[PDB]
Amino acid sequence: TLAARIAISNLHKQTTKQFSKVVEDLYRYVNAATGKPAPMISDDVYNIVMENKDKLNSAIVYDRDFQYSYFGFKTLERSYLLRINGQVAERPQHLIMRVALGIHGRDIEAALETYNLMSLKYFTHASPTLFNAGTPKPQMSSCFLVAMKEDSIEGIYDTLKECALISKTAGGIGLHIHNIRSTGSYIAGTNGTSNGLIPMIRVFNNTARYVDQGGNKRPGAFALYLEPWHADIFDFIDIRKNHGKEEIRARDLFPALWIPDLFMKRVEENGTWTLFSPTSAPGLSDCYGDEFEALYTRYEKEGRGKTIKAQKLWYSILEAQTETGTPFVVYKDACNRKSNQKNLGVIKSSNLCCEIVEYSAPDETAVCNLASVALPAFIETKTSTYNFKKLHEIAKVVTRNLNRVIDRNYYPVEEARKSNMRHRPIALGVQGLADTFMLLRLPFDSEEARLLNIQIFETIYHASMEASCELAQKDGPYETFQGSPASQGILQFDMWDQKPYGMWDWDTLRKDIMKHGVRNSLTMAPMPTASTNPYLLRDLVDLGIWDEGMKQYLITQNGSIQGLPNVPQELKDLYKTVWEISQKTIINMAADRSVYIDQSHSLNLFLRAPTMGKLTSMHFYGWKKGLKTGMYYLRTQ
Amino acid sequence: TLAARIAISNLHKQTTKQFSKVVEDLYRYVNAATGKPAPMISDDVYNIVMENKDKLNSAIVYDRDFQYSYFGFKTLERSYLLRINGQVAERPQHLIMRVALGIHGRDIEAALETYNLMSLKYFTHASPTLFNAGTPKPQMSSCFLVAMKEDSIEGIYDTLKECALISKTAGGIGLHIHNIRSTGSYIAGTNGTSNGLIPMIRVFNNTARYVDQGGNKRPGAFALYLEPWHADIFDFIDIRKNHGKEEIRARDLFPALWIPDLFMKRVEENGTWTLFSPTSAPGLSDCYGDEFEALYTRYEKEGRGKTIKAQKLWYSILEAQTETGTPFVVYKDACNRKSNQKNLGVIKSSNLCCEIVEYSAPDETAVCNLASVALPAFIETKTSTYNFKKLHEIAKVVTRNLNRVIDRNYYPVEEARKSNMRHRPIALGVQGLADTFMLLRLPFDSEEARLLNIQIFETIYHASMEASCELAQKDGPYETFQGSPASQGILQFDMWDQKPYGMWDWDTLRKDIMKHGVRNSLTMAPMPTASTNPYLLRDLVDLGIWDEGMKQYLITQNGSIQGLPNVPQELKDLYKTVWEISQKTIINMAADRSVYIDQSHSLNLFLRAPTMGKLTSMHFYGWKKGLKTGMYYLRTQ
Numbered sequence A, B: 001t002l003a004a005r006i007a008i009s010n011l012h013k014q015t016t017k018q019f020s021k022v023v024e025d026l027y028r029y030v031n032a033a034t035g036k037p038a039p040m041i042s043d044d045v046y047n048i049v050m051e052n053k054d055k056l057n058s059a060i061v062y063d064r065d066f067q068y069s070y071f072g073f074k075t076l077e078r079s080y081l082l083r084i085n086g087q088v089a090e091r092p093q094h095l096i097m098r099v100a101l102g103i104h105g106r107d108i109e110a111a112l113e114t115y116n117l118m119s120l121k122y123f124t125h126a127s128p129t130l131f132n133a134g135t136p137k138p139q140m141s142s143c144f145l146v147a148m149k150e151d152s153i154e155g156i157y158d159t160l161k162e163c164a165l166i167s168k169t170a171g172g173i174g175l176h177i178h179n180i181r182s183t184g185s186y187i188a189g190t191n192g193t194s195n196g197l198i199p200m201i202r203v204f205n206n207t208a209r210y211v212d213q214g215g216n217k218r219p220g221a222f223a224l225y226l227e228p229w230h231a232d233i234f235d236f237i238d239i240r241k242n243h244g245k246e247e248i249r250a251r252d253l254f255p256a257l258w259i260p261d262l263f264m265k266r267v268e269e270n271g272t273w274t275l276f277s278p279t280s281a282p283g284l285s286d287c288y289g290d291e292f293e294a295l296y297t298r299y300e301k302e303g304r305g306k307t308i309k310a311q312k313l314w315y316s317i318l319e320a321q322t323e324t325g326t327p328f329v330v331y332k333d334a335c336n337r338k339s340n341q342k343n344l345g346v347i348k349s350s351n352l353c354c355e356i357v358e359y360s361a362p363d364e365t366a367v368c369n370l371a372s373v374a375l376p377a378f379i380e381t382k383t384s385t386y387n388f389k390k391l392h393e394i395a396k397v398v399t400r401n402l403n404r405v406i407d408r409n410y411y412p413v414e415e416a417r418k419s420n421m422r423h424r425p426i427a428l429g430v431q432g433l434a435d436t437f438m439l440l441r442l443p444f445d446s447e448e449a450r451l452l453n454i455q456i457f458e459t460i461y462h463a464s465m466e467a468s469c470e471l472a473q474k475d476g477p478y479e480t481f482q483g484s485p486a487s488q489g490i491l492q493f494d495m496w497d498q499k500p501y502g503m504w505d506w507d508t509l510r511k512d513i514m515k516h517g518v519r520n521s522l523t524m525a526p527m528p529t530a531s532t533n534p535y536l537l538r539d540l541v542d543l544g545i546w547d548e549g550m551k552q553y554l555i556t557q558n559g560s561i562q563g564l565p566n567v568p569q570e571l572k573d574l575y576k577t578v579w580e581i582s583q584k585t586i587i588n589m590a591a592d593r594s595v596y597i598d599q600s601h602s603l604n605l606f607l608r609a610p611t612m613g614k615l616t617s618m619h620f621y622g623w624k625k626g627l628k629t630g631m632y633y634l635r636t637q
Ligand SMILES: Nc1ncnc2c1ncn2[C@@H]1O[C@H](COP(=O)(O)OP(=O)(O)NP(=O)(O)O)[C@@H](O)[C@H]1O
Pocket: A151, A152, A153, A154, A180, A181, A186, A187, A188, A189, A190, A192, A193, A194, A195, A196, B167, B168, B169, B210, B211, B212, B213, B214, B215, B216
């Protein structure tokens, strides 16, 4: 809350009054230009709004529209509030109210609370849910994880279809392509050899550009997952390279390596690494860990690839990350080993923010159905505690919300719908970790921010897990739960090798889960969000120093306050810069919260003058650390 | 025949001996690198070669391999003779012999003569036939005329599939796209408007690049046909423009206008021309002439487009042709009006060389099944005549050859196969017009080269027509012949408004055709070929002048001999340059031969300093002249 809150209330003035009418407007709307009935509300939902209009308008509390961050509102106005004809036809509460209804049909009770919590900034869904929830094509889902359906032209162009047919509504896409042959591999049609990936990519990077004015975003953030033994690996990690004068100016593709441990082994024990066109080495992206090392090992034996210094790739890879900050690294074995869907098959890729990790097949495209809970709004008392009951509580709710989405979602491609339906993956997220910390005035390093951390996720996983049981208790287990690690009482940390930090009763849980099942194969995918230092500001009053006599140190420096004349230790330990905090503490809290995460989540370790040898300790640290999504991003300068 | 014939016979030495063994080799061949059975002969054909090996090797006459033009052989060696492992495994005769067999199965008699004529350079098929005829994927067809299946993403990407799935084997492609909406037109999905064509094009221009190493050619000569009332017309004619810094560097697309007469009317009577996104103006590429002018006329009435100075387009168009030599012009109404397939629907486009003109639908892709007869090899006696019987004769044969191709062709896309099968379009071509003339020593202008001309086609059309009857006499009418102009005795010139030049009995013909039908809806598509002055050289001896005392005038000038010191009139009237000959005589002979051409064929009028006003008389001349393929190409400097 700053001095520009006028943009809220004075533009709470060009807004009409009663939810009901605003819906009417939106429902009844017409294309003032083509005279086309252009509704922005589904028949289905509209009637629900009319049938209840009374209790609804009543229910809303418009005073809550002032309880919004300055840059926050702007976001909504610019992009989330349904406009009428160029003009904003939605008070934030309306949006909320339409989202709330979006999710539950006749479940008005459910609608109303899942209303209130939202309005009381407790949690919020993903843009996709925000944007379309309630409207005629209620696509509320975030990303899609697409499988390169075949290594035939029929395949590629059937894949290319989706990557558009989705890309046209929807959100981010991440497709894995370990099965397309390598440069100069062999066509059994004619005298041709293979073009490779990179031109085939230039293709996908191109439907990307064109298919967009509808996907309501030129940003075509596609990410491409590929195992590092593919004979085309080098050209692949290179994509975004600042040079390439007839190449991929792939300003919207990003390359992600889907890395088995073998590679990281070879690398460390400085050795060999063999490459393959997949055609000569079949079945490779289908085995993993041991089954995979037997396999790969033997195609080396059998002499099918092109042996290189394992240290060569790793070396080039590194170079690329620095110059471009890509490829991303996800650990193939870390992920499958510790996935609850290991029963289905082999998870071949994760997604752009290298967060969700769920099965995909040429006839299953996986979805990111996600909401994210606002960690800071459970802080409670001058100095304070955190309400873990409230947490458990709210996160029980969201797990319900998200489940619904899975049923009321508008599916872009039949694949998507099969997938989401048999497996029911959710993704609870979280916002405000860094905050919560600073509010409870704990420094990022505290071996008690350390503590807090663990407990939080512990509680979320705990709740989501339980909520999911009851609905599986009410509605039946998700369709494919048998064979599940959970179908045998093995849980996230159990697959890591730990004991819960025990703040919740996992026995009673693990007990019922076997007895009732759960409504979803996965539950949480924490922190790769923004729209889905201000903290000093406050503190500097009580001690001293200020404004006219101090438009100085920080305007200059990046909120890096270590060693500033007249400023407390308590503070410059709390309000630590991100370069300033220890990475092996970040990697660490990471691998901590990691134990109660069905999915994965992403690191962005933040060093200064990173060495082809520093970066390496960082990757190997986390690597060795059991982590699922490797180091995902390194920011430099 | 020059002094380098050594490349034939001395490299007739690294060739093995008896056809049969050469087949064996080719049949039995293996991928010396992947150990894959890599045959180059179909089971089907192989056995035919063994079952008859005796009469076959015998039959061949290898002395004929010396009867080849210097640059000619090179063509074969470089690209037509099946290589073994990098090394040429085919004497020209073998190729021929495999082509010959390619076409007829057990029809050895047919094989053998259709052998001999070929070997006696009388006619030859299209590369596609040359290359693959006999081999396991006997795709022998030239182009494909593809229909933009829908104005949905499902459509576009289903079209894009073919334009690859074909493009991967096969030959040239020409697709028409009058149905895709215009820039900023309206998506009834969301807040998007249309990207337009040009980006959608950038898409097709891109599968073009990638899908090629198999299509055994980086050249992706796609041509795109579009009516000039499409709201995106301007950007469309611009494609190849030497400027466009985030545009189509469409180094392999070419834009062709599919122009109704209305436009050319408006233009001349200096007036208006309205543009449309097709969505607001539906049915437009489906009506023509009168039905079309009623339609279009009324969308003007109704005020649906964006009225421009008809003279504006025409003006821009022109500019484009000069700077790029495109768009090509085909006359939509000229073509449908005088098509024998008018019964099926509306021919929406022709093809790259703007020659064939046959129906296409989102479930019919039309084919160019073609061979071409060598006009010069019927000249017969010091000075001479032309044997029209031989012509009629040989061209009877080719019409048989080509028919077979239609049945033994390997079809890339089910569409192709339906089309070719129900309609049976052929394309007899011709080579050596310009020659024949000079051999019978007649000048391009002679009102008796004028005469000869007409008669030739008259005879070819006459023969092909008759040959086609008999097989329709033997095999039945092509599947869709009822409703045919011919199914009513109306023939090519009859649809023009003429009487045959009567050198053949058209009554007896027109008689039987109604009685038996014909095997093909179309027959001929003359002169847009090369691989499918040397004439002075000879003459300069008998009079005088030569070599050491004359490495002069022409080495310099473009065989333009008008006014050279000591050189006969007889000659410099015969060996006239192409800029030097009259265009309205070219346009004219054109519109002459035109009357006996089922299909179309193409002009390349050749002026010097062409004016936005000179070009115009040329287009309007031919236009008014009844022509089907407008002026197709203008070469300048
Ligand atoms: N004309 C072409 N241009 C580029 N790549 C091609 C072409 N034809 C096939 N490929 C490659 O071959 C793979 C797909 O196989 P496809 O072309 O559908 O079957 P095919 O290669 O003819 N037969 P096979 O080798 O038996 O699968 C892809 O990785 C393509 O790159």
